[PDB]
Design an enzyme around this catalytic site. Sequence first.
Site, PDB file in Angstrom:
ATOM      1  CG  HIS A  61     -35.003   7.618 -19.287  1.00 14.76           C
ATOM      2  ND1 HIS A  61     -34.984   8.700 -18.405  1.00 14.76           N
ATOM      3  CD2 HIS A  61     -33.936   6.822 -19.024  1.00 14.76           C
ATOM      4  CE1 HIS A  61     -33.893   8.540 -17.665  1.00 14.76           C
ATOM      5  NE2 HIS A  61     -33.224   7.437 -18.008  1.00 14.76           N
ATOM      6  CG  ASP A 124     -32.736  18.982 -22.320  1.00  9.66           C
ATOM      7  OD1 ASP A 124     -32.297  19.717 -23.229  1.00  9.66           O
ATOM      8  OD2 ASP A 124     -33.795  19.219 -21.700  1.00  9.66           O
ATOM      9  CD  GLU A 239     -33.077  23.030 -23.325  1.00 15.46           C
ATOM     10  OE1 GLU A 239     -32.970  22.006 -24.032  1.00 15.46           O
ATOM     11  OE2 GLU A 239     -33.135  22.993 -22.077  1.00 15.46           O
TER      12      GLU A 239
END
Length: 456
Positions: A61, A124, A239
Amino acid sequence: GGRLSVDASDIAEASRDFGGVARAEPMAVFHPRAAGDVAGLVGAAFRSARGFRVSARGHGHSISGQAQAAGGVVVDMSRVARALPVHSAALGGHYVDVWGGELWVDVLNWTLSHGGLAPRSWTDYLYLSVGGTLSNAGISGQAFHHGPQISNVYELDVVTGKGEVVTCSETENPDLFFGVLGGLGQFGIITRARIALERAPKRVRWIRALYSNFSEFTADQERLISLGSGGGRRFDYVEGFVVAAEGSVLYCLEVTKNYDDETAGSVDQDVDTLLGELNFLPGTVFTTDLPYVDFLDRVHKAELKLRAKGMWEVPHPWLNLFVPASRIADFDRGVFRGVLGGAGAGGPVLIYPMNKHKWDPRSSAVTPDEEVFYLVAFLRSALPGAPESLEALARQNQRILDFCAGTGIGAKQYLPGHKARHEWAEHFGAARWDRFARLKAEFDPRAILAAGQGIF
Ligand SMILES: *Cc1cc2c(cc1C)nc1c(=O)[nH]c(=O)nc-1n2C[C@H](O)[C@H](O)[C@H](O)COP(=O)(O)OP(=O)(O)OC[C@H]1O[C@@H](n2cnc3c(N)ncnc32)[C@H](O)[C@@H]1O
Ligand SMILES: NC(=O)c1ccccc1NC(=O)Nc1cc(Cl)cc(Cl)c1
């Protein structure tokens, strides 16, 4: 026990990442069965004449080739018997030993099905490896309270750049433990991490509220992250994100309140009491009630919808900054209204504050020199098969960095994409750079590991 592979699909995968730009090819991909196999391969690189590059790959990632090992070997850490959660009377809670390549989604499913336990601090996105997030920090809406994932690990097994397997923690080989945490893979490969666990909530009351005033939005986020520091009523997740007017800018506050069978009778009142103290725009409260696993897996659901539209495997020139709270106001007129004013395929612009005291200063993680700082994440994707879209987003990123530089904002990059020695010395600062270089001399003198980070 492990095997080298020259399969073109294995080489191709190990030669790319989610960023979709950096493409440095290894000679082979190593598929280990256990820690000793990783030690075997790293030990052979250390003993070798040339000293070939070895990098561990989590789920790939990375944005700018941090897991690539040019002409060397990529260790495919993806996955066998699993350790059950354990209770400790000395630690006053539970933990679970996990393989470094384990994905957080698999960790969660394992701990839930074995005692209804779960990690306390998340990212997340759950399709990330444990070793990969622990080499950075691992942040989401829980970090203000529990700290990042690097503040929620008791112990590690690390294969150093010398091919030595070392068990480390705050009490045993602490230089290696704290060095590795946030250490960008520079001092060793995590083969085991001992993750802190809590009794999982069953459900989530997931709330979103809109703001047109940035000063009220930030003051509310900052007030919310100061709660529970005195032991009282608070949200379990804080958030935020920047919204474009259609579909000039709005700010979305995103909060959750975790609950189970016991607390289900007080959840509606806890939410209404906390929301009553806020200054969001009236009539902009959107609420949803769903299982805890479903809330945590929300980004994977968005991913399946994007894969269906051919909008997932596109370039991702993602930029992540930690911005001192004292400079966040200036950040909004100059960036959100300025630079981004007037986009590519789109994507979120995340924004939320965190408490520095939840971050251990002994770790390798680099945060601004301020008690409260924000993550500002520019997560915009380029248009599919459109190279010029990637170019325009890359120029916007350079404009954001030049804005921080030109106004003296002491921002620090998270998942730093630096490649020049003077950029790294500046990123760390004199004292941290000295500790970083000394740790490298001790645990990876030949600079075998994670050379794709471009530090040594
Ligand atoms: C793609 C993405 C990333 C992401 C995210 C959502 C998406 C869609 N959400 C995040 C979030 O909410 N919060 C956060 O902190 N990070 C988030 N990210 C970024 C993510 O943490 C990073 O991409 C990170 O690199 C982990 O991803 P991954 O597991 O795929 O790891 P990698 O890219 O292959 O490797 C990263 C670096 O670490 C080294 N490495 C890899 N595994 C190990 C082990 N076991 N031990 C030591 N070093 C390791 C790599 O060599 C590379 O340098
Ligand atoms: N709503 C989201 O958080 C989101 C939605 C679609 C795709 C990605 C999502 N989030 C995400 O990538 N968060 C992330 C990504 C990175 Cl690279 C670093 C940090 Cl701190 C946060």
